[PDB]
Structure formats: structure tokens, C-alpha cells
Amino acid sequence: AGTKLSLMPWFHGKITREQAERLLYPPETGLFLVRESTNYPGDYTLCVSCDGKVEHYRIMYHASKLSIDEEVYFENLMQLVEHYTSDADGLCTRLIKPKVM
């Protein structure tokens, strides 16, 4: 049927930044979704609603390792979400509630 990542509730796939802003409304503390840029796959962007607005955290790749702060690194995107769900660790909020997809 698909990959583990494709069936994740927070993963929306190839949607634009403007469409991500429309989904994460009204602003909810912890409401988040992960969008993929149609670059180039898989240029991901962690879209999370904090302090009344949507903050966009762009995923970067250093030697096939995923990060959004150049401090904490992950093997894959699903490890990134799992980590930031539990603790903020520099982010504006914990990834509390995923936007249903």
C-alpha cells in the first residue's frame, strides 16, 4: 500500500507552504504537520503552530542525517517527529497534536 512515512497522520506529502498555513488554522499550541517540497525529494518542512502563528522548520541533510537546528541529528524523519513530540528541545512547542491526514 505504501511506506511507513506515507501512512503517518502528520505527513501530508507534496503540499505548498500556503496550503500548510490554511490547514494549521486556527492557531493551536502543538498543532503540526510535515510537508514535502517538490524540489527535489525529500525536502521536508516541519510546520508547527506556536504563539499564534505557523513556524516553518526546514529539514537539512548532513551526511544523510536529518536535522532542523544543527545540534540534534536523526536517522530518518519519523525519528525527528518522535523526538520533538516528547520534548521541545529548542523548538517553539512540543509536537502535541498532528493535523489529520
Author numbering: 73 to 173
What does the paper say about this structure?
C-terminal Src kinase (Csk) and Csk-homologous kinase (Chk) are members of the CSK family of protein tyrosine kinases. These proteins suppress the activity of Src family kinases (SFKs) by selectively phosphorylating the conserved C-terminal tail regulatory tyrosine. Csk and Chk both contain SH3, SH2, and kinase domains, which are separated by the SH3–SH2 and SH2-kinase linkers. The Csk SH2 domain is crucial in stabilizing the kinase domain in the active conformation.
Mills et al. studied the unique disulfide bond of Csk SH2 that is absent in other known SH2 domains. Crystal structures of both oxidized SH2 and C122S SH2 were solved and refined. As the structure refinement for the oxidized form of L-SH2 progressed, the maps indicated dual conformations for the residue C122, which were successfully modeled as such. Therefore, the high-resolution structures of oxidized L-SH2 reveal dual conformations of disulfide bond that were not observed in the lower-resolution structure of full-length Csk. X-ray crystallography data were also consistent with the NMR observation, in which most of the changes in chemical shift took place in the residues close to C122, and this area was likely to undergo greater structural change than in the C164 residue area. The S–S distance of the disulfide bond was 2.0 Å, whereas the O–S distance in the C122S mutant was 3.7 Å. Formation of the disulfide bond assisted in the packing of αB to the hydrophobic region of the protein consisting of βC and βD. The disulfide bond formation significantly enhances the thermal stability of SH2 domain and assists in the packing of αB into the hydrophobic region of the protein consisting of βC and βD. The crystal structure also revealed that the linker region fold back on the SH2 domain. Additionally, the hydrophobic interactions between L77 in the linker and L149, F83, and Y116 make the linker fold back to the SH2 and thus stabilizing the structure.
